[PDB]
A paper describes a structure:
Hence, this loss of critical proteins has the potential to compromise ER proteostasis and generate cellular stress. This challenge to normal metabolism is overcome by the activity of the cytosolic coatomer protein I (COPI) polymer, whose repeating unit is the coatomer, a 560 kDa complex of seven distinct gene products (α-, β-, β′-, γ-, δ-, ε-, and ζ-COPI)25–31. Overall, the coatomer functions to retrieve the escaped “client” proteins, such as type I membrane proteins, from cis-Golgi back to ER by retrograde trafficking. In particular, the S protein – a type I membrane protein – is delivered to the ERGIC from both the ER (by anterograde trafficking) and the Golgi (by retrograde trafficking)3,10–12. Here we utilize recombinant SARS-CoV-2 S proteins and tail peptides, including constructs with enhanced mimicry of the coatomer binding motif (clientized S protein), to elucidate the atomic structure of the S-coatomer interface.
To gain insight into the role of the basic cluster in stabilizing S-coatomer interactions, we generated alanine mutants of αWD40 Arg13, Lys15, and Arg300, which are equivalent to the β‘WD40 basic cluster residues Arg15, Lys17, and Arg272, respectively. Finally, the Lys15Ala mutant did not bind to either the wild-type or clientized Thr1273Glu S heptapeptides, and a 1.6 Å resolution crystal structure revealed this was due to conformational occlusion of the αWD40 binding site by an inward rotation of nearby Arg13 and His31 side chains, rather than loss of Lys15 interactions. L Superposition of wild-type (white) and Lys15Ala mutant (yellow) crystal structures shows substantial perturbation and inward rotation of Arg13 and His31 side chains in the mutant to block the S heptapeptide binding site. We therefore generated wild-type and clientized Thr1273Glu S heptapeptides with amidation at the C-terminal main chain carboxylate, which neutralizes the main chain charge that interacts with αWD40 Lys15. This approach does not perturb the binding site architecture of αWD40, unlike mutagenesis. Loss of αWD40 binding was observed for the amidated wild-type S heptapeptide but not the amidated clientized Thr1273Glu S heptapeptide. In contrast, Arg13 and Lys15 residues in αWD40 provide the basis for basal binding to both wild-type and clientized S molecules.
Author numbering: 1 to 171, 200 to 331
Write the structure that this text describes.
Protein backbone atom coordinates (compact mmCIF):
# COMPACT_ATOMS: atom_id res chain seq x y z
CA UNK A 1 0.00 0.00 0.00
CA UNK A 2 0.93 3.64 -0.43
CA UNK A 3 0.26 6.59 1.83
CA UNK A 4 -1.08 9.72 0.13
CA UNK A 5 -0.39 12.53 2.60
CA UNK A 6 -3.03 15.29 2.61
CA UNK A 7 -1.86 17.46 5.48
CA UNK A 8 1.09 17.71 7.85
CA UNK A 9 1.62 19.90 10.89
CA UNK A 10 5.10 20.35 12.29
CA UNK A 11 5.17 20.92 16.05
CA UNK A 12 6.45 19.59 19.29
CA UNK A 13 5.31 16.09 20.23
CA UNK A 14 1.62 15.41 19.64
CA UNK A 15 -0.39 12.98 21.71
CA UNK A 16 -3.94 12.96 20.38
CA UNK A 17 -5.89 13.71 17.21
CA UNK A 18 -9.65 13.85 16.60
CA UNK A 19 -11.56 14.10 13.31
CA UNK A 20 -14.68 16.24 13.14
CA UNK A 21 -17.45 14.01 11.74
CA UNK A 22 -18.71 16.56 9.16
CA UNK A 23 -16.24 19.53 8.88
CA UNK A 24 -12.76 19.09 7.34
CA UNK A 25 -11.17 19.65 10.73
CA UNK A 26 -8.91 17.88 13.19
CA UNK A 27 -8.16 18.74 16.77
CA UNK A 28 -4.61 17.98 17.87
CA UNK A 29 -3.56 17.82 21.50
CA UNK A 30 0.09 18.38 22.30
CA UNK A 31 2.65 17.59 24.99
CA UNK A 32 3.04 21.33 25.59
CA UNK A 33 -0.51 21.56 26.92
CA UNK A 34 -2.02 23.23 23.87
CA UNK A 35 -4.82 22.09 21.56
CA UNK A 36 -4.88 23.05 17.86
CA UNK A 37 -7.84 23.07 15.44
CA UNK A 38 -6.72 22.59 11.81
CA UNK A 39 -8.58 22.59 8.50
CA UNK A 40 -6.72 19.85 6.63
CA UNK A 41 -8.23 20.68 3.24
CA UNK A 42 -6.89 24.23 3.22
CA UNK A 43 -3.92 23.74 5.55
CA UNK A 44 -5.02 26.52 7.91
CA UNK A 45 -4.91 26.88 11.71
CA UNK A 46 -8.45 27.76 12.73
CA UNK A 47 -8.02 28.16 16.48
CA UNK A 48 -5.91 27.31 19.53
CA UNK A 49 -7.19 26.26 22.93
CA UNK A 50 -5.19 26.59 26.16
CA UNK A 51 -6.79 25.06 29.25
CA UNK A 52 -4.19 22.62 30.53
CA UNK A 53 -0.73 22.52 32.12
CA UNK A 54 1.37 19.68 30.80
CA UNK A 55 0.60 17.11 28.08
CA UNK A 56 -2.98 16.74 26.80
CA UNK A 57 -3.50 13.11 25.73
CA UNK A 58 -7.31 12.93 25.52
CA UNK A 59 -9.20 14.78 22.80
CA UNK A 60 -12.53 14.16 21.08
CA UNK A 61 -15.43 15.88 19.32
CA UNK A 62 -19.05 15.25 20.18
CA UNK A 63 -20.66 13.63 17.11
CA UNK A 64 -23.47 16.21 16.83
CA UNK A 65 -23.12 18.94 19.47
CA UNK A 66 -20.69 21.92 19.04
CA UNK A 67 -18.54 20.48 21.84
CA UNK A 68 -15.19 18.81 22.33
CA UNK A 69 -13.55 17.24 25.37
CA UNK A 70 -9.90 17.21 26.40
CA UNK A 71 -8.04 15.33 29.10
CA UNK A 72 -4.68 16.22 30.62
CA UNK A 73 -1.75 15.22 32.76
CA UNK A 74 -3.13 17.94 35.10
CA UNK A 75 -5.98 15.44 35.83
CA UNK A 76 -8.67 17.68 34.27
CA UNK A 77 -11.40 16.71 31.85
CA UNK A 78 -12.35 19.93 30.07
CA UNK A 79 -15.51 20.52 28.04
CA UNK A 80 -15.35 23.15 25.34
CA UNK A 81 -17.78 24.79 22.90
CA UNK A 82 -15.92 25.31 19.65
CA UNK A 83 -18.54 27.64 18.13
CA UNK A 84 -18.51 30.09 21.03
CA UNK A 85 -14.82 29.23 21.57
CA UNK A 86 -15.30 28.88 25.34
CA UNK A 87 -14.12 26.47 28.01
CA UNK A 88 -17.53 25.64 29.47
CA UNK A 89 -16.42 23.72 32.56
CA UNK A 90 -13.86 21.29 34.01
CA UNK A 91 -14.83 17.84 35.33
CA UNK A 92 -12.60 17.20 38.32
CA UNK A 93 -12.21 13.96 40.18
CA UNK A 94 -9.38 12.02 38.60
CA UNK A 95 -6.29 11.77 40.83
CA UNK A 96 -3.59 11.12 38.17
CA UNK A 97 -3.01 11.67 34.43
CA UNK A 98 -6.04 11.42 32.14
CA UNK A 99 -5.20 9.13 29.20
CA UNK A 100 -8.36 9.11 27.01
CA UNK A 101 -11.68 10.94 26.95
CA UNK A 102 -14.60 10.49 24.56
CA UNK A 103 -18.32 11.23 24.19
CA UNK A 104 -21.09 8.67 23.91
CA UNK A 105 -22.92 8.64 20.55
CA UNK A 106 -26.45 8.82 22.09
CA UNK A 107 -26.45 9.29 25.87
CA UNK A 108 -25.23 12.59 27.37
CA UNK A 109 -22.08 10.95 28.67
CA UNK A 110 -18.32 11.47 28.67
CA UNK A 111 -15.92 8.61 29.36
CA UNK A 112 -12.46 9.24 30.81
CA UNK A 113 -9.77 6.89 32.04
CA UNK A 114 -6.70 7.53 34.11
CA UNK A 115 -3.43 6.50 35.72
CA UNK A 116 -5.47 6.59 39.00
CA UNK A 117 -6.71 3.05 37.90
CA UNK A 118 -10.31 4.18 37.27
CA UNK A 119 -12.64 4.83 34.38
CA UNK A 120 -15.17 7.63 35.07
CA UNK A 121 -18.48 8.22 33.32
CA UNK A 122 -19.75 11.78 33.48
CA UNK A 123 -23.05 13.36 32.45
CA UNK A 124 -22.17 16.50 30.52
CA UNK A 125 -25.67 17.95 30.97
CA UNK A 126 -25.62 17.65 34.81
CA UNK A 127 -21.82 17.98 35.16
CA UNK A 128 -21.84 15.08 37.62
CA UNK A 129 -19.77 11.93 37.74
CA UNK A 130 -22.36 9.17 37.33
CA UNK A 131 -20.08 6.14 37.60
CA UNK A 132 -16.57 5.14 38.70
CA UNK A 133 -15.43 1.84 37.21
CA UNK A 134 -12.88 0.26 39.56
CA UNK A 135 -11.02 -3.01 39.40
CA UNK A 136 -7.97 -2.42 37.27
CA UNK A 137 -4.77 -2.57 39.36
CA UNK A 138 -2.49 -0.21 37.37
CA UNK A 139 -2.85 2.71 34.97
CA UNK A 140 -5.87 2.61 32.66
CA UNK A 141 -4.34 3.56 29.31
CA UNK A 142 -7.46 3.53 27.12
CA UNK A 143 -11.22 3.09 27.20
CA UNK A 144 -13.97 3.19 24.56
CA UNK A 145 -17.75 3.00 24.34
CA UNK A 146 -19.15 0.29 22.10
CA UNK A 147 -20.93 1.82 19.06
CA UNK A 148 -24.24 -0.05 19.49
CA UNK A 149 -24.25 -2.00 22.81
CA UNK A 150 -24.12 -0.93 26.46
CA UNK A 151 -20.47 -1.90 26.84
CA UNK A 152 -17.10 -0.25 27.49
CA UNK A 153 -13.68 -1.77 26.76
CA UNK A 154 -10.59 -0.66 28.68
CA UNK A 155 -6.85 -1.46 28.55
CA UNK A 156 -4.46 -1.30 31.50
CA UNK A 157 -0.81 -1.65 32.44
CA UNK A 158 -2.12 -4.43 34.70
CA UNK A 159 -1.90 -6.58 31.52
CA UNK A 160 -5.67 -6.96 31.10
CA UNK A 161 -8.37 -5.75 28.75
CA UNK A 162 -11.71 -5.41 30.52
CA UNK A 163 -15.19 -5.36 28.93
CA UNK A 164 -17.74 -3.70 31.20
CA UNK A 165 -21.55 -4.02 31.10
CA UNK A 166 -23.10 -0.57 31.58
CA UNK A 167 -26.73 -1.51 30.86
CA UNK A 168 -27.51 -0.75 34.49
CA UNK A 169 -26.38 2.84 34.15
CA UNK A 170 -28.35 3.18 30.91
CA UNK A 171 -31.42 2.28 32.97
CA UNK A 172 -24.75 -2.51 39.57
CA UNK A 173 -24.72 0.39 37.12
CA UNK A 174 -21.42 -0.97 35.79
CA UNK A 175 -20.32 -4.59 36.13
CA UNK A 176 -17.23 -6.21 34.65
CA UNK A 177 -18.25 -8.78 32.02
CA UNK A 178 -14.92 -10.03 30.68
CA UNK A 179 -11.36 -9.80 32.00
CA UNK A 180 -9.45 -10.64 28.85
CA UNK A 181 -6.12 -12.25 29.56
CA UNK A 182 -3.59 -12.72 26.84
CA UNK A 183 -1.06 -9.92 26.93
CA UNK A 184 2.02 -10.61 29.09
CA UNK A 185 2.98 -6.92 29.49
CA UNK A 186 1.01 -3.70 29.96
CA UNK A 187 -1.76 -2.87 27.48
CA UNK A 188 -1.77 0.63 25.98
CA UNK A 189 -4.77 0.66 23.66
CA UNK A 190 -8.08 -1.00 22.87
CA UNK A 191 -10.65 -0.50 20.12
CA UNK A 192 -14.02 -1.80 18.91
CA UNK A 193 -14.84 -2.45 15.28
CA UNK A 194 -17.69 -0.10 14.26
CA UNK A 195 -19.94 -2.86 12.83
CA UNK A 196 -18.36 -6.28 13.51
CA UNK A 197 -18.21 -7.93 16.99
CA UNK A 198 -14.44 -7.54 17.25
CA UNK A 199 -11.98 -5.91 19.65
CA UNK A 200 -8.32 -4.93 19.12
CA UNK A 201 -5.78 -4.43 21.88
CA UNK A 202 -2.08 -3.58 21.85
CA UNK A 203 0.76 -2.78 24.15
CA UNK A 204 4.24 -3.08 25.62
CA UNK A 205 4.54 -6.72 24.50
CA UNK A 206 4.72 -5.32 20.93
CA UNK A 207 1.61 -7.36 20.08
CA UNK A 208 -1.71 -6.43 18.49
CA UNK A 209 -4.37 -8.92 19.53
CA UNK A 210 -7.73 -9.51 17.82
CA UNK A 211 -10.67 -10.71 19.92
CA UNK A 212 -14.19 -11.75 18.98
CA UNK A 213 -17.21 -11.46 21.27
CA UNK A 214 -20.77 -12.62 21.54
CA UNK A 215 -23.29 -11.64 24.20
CA UNK A 216 -22.14 -14.53 26.31
CA UNK A 217 -18.43 -15.16 25.62
CA UNK A 218 -15.22 -13.87 24.00
CA UNK A 219 -12.09 -15.35 22.62
CA UNK A 220 -8.70 -14.48 21.28
CA UNK A 221 -8.70 -14.88 17.47
CA UNK A 222 -5.08 -14.24 16.57
CA UNK A 223 -2.10 -11.88 17.06
CA UNK A 224 -0.32 -9.42 14.75
CA UNK A 225 3.41 -9.93 15.38
CA UNK A 226 6.24 -7.80 14.09
CA UNK A 227 6.50 -4.44 15.84
CA UNK A 228 9.87 -4.16 17.58
CA UNK A 229 8.93 -1.64 20.28
CA UNK A 230 5.84 -0.72 22.32
CA UNK A 231 2.60 -0.47 20.33
CA UNK A 232 0.92 2.87 21.15
CA UNK A 233 -2.37 2.53 19.31
CA UNK A 234 -4.41 0.26 17.03
CA UNK A 235 -7.63 0.55 15.06
CA UNK A 236 -9.85 -1.15 12.54
CA UNK A 237 -10.29 0.12 9.03
CA UNK A 238 -14.08 0.69 9.07
CA UNK A 239 -14.65 -0.26 5.43
CA UNK A 240 -11.79 -2.60 4.37
CA UNK A 241 -10.58 -5.87 5.89
CA UNK A 242 -7.53 -4.20 7.45
CA UNK A 243 -6.03 -3.47 10.90
CA UNK A 244 -3.71 -0.54 11.55
CA UNK A 245 -1.21 -0.13 14.39
CA UNK A 246 1.30 2.52 15.38
CA UNK A 247 4.41 2.09 17.49
CA UNK A 248 7.46 3.56 19.25
CA UNK A 249 9.47 1.54 16.67
CA UNK A 250 8.65 4.52 14.37
CA UNK A 251 6.25 2.57 12.14
CA UNK A 252 2.62 2.45 11.21
CA UNK A 253 1.75 -1.12 10.16
CA UNK A 254 -1.19 -2.37 8.08
CA UNK A 255 -2.33 -5.96 8.56
CA UNK A 256 -4.87 -8.26 6.94
CA UNK A 257 -7.94 -8.60 9.20
CA UNK A 258 -8.57 -12.22 8.17
CA UNK A 259 -5.04 -13.65 8.29
CA UNK A 260 -3.17 -11.09 10.48
CA UNK A 261 -0.30 -11.04 8.02
CA UNK A 262 1.63 -7.90 7.28
CA UNK A 263 0.32 -5.84 4.36
CA UNK A 264 2.48 -2.68 4.47
CA UNK A 265 4.85 -0.85 6.83
CA UNK A 266 5.28 2.92 6.82
CA UNK A 267 8.30 4.29 8.67
CA UNK A 268 9.53 7.67 9.85
CA UNK A 269 13.27 8.05 10.30
CA UNK A 270 13.24 10.05 13.52
CA UNK A 271 9.70 10.01 14.95
CA UNK A 272 7.92 7.58 17.27
CA UNK A 273 4.16 7.23 16.71
CA UNK A 274 1.83 7.83 19.68
CA UNK A 275 -1.71 7.70 18.25
CA UNK A 276 -3.69 6.96 15.09
CA UNK A 277 -7.34 7.57 14.22
CA UNK A 278 -9.69 7.07 11.27
CA UNK A 279 -12.50 9.25 10.03
CA UNK A 280 -15.83 7.48 10.53
CA UNK A 281 -16.97 7.81 6.89
CA UNK A 282 -14.06 8.88 4.70
CA UNK A 283 -10.92 6.85 3.84
CA UNK A 284 -8.96 9.31 5.95
CA UNK A 285 -6.46 8.60 8.74
CA UNK A 286 -4.45 10.77 11.09
CA UNK A 287 -1.36 10.02 13.14
CA UNK A 288 0.38 11.80 15.99
CA UNK A 289 4.15 11.49 16.35
CA UNK A 290 7.21 13.13 17.91
CA UNK A 291 7.25 16.00 15.36
CA UNK A 292 3.55 16.71 14.76
CA UNK A 293 0.56 15.22 12.97
CA UNK A 294 -0.16 13.82 9.53
CA UNK A 295 -3.45 13.22 7.71
CA UNK A 296 -3.33 10.66 4.93
CA UNK A 297 -5.27 8.36 2.66
CA UNK A 298 -4.31 4.71 2.14
CA UNK A 299 -4.24 3.39 -1.44
CA UNK A 300 -3.23 0.09 -3.02
CA UNK A 301 0.33 0.08 -4.32
CA UNK A 302 0.61 1.35 -7.93
CA UNK A 303 -2.96 2.64 -8.13
Amino acid sequence: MEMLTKFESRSSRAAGVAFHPTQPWILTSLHNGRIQLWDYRMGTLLDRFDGHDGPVRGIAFHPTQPLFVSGGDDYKVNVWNYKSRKLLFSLCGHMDYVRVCTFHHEYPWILSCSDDQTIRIWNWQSRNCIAILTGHSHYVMCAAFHPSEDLIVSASLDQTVRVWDISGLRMTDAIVKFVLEGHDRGVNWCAFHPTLPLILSAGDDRLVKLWRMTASKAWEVDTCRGHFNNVSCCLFHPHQELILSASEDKTIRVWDLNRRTAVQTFRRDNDRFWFITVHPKLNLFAAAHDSGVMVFKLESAWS
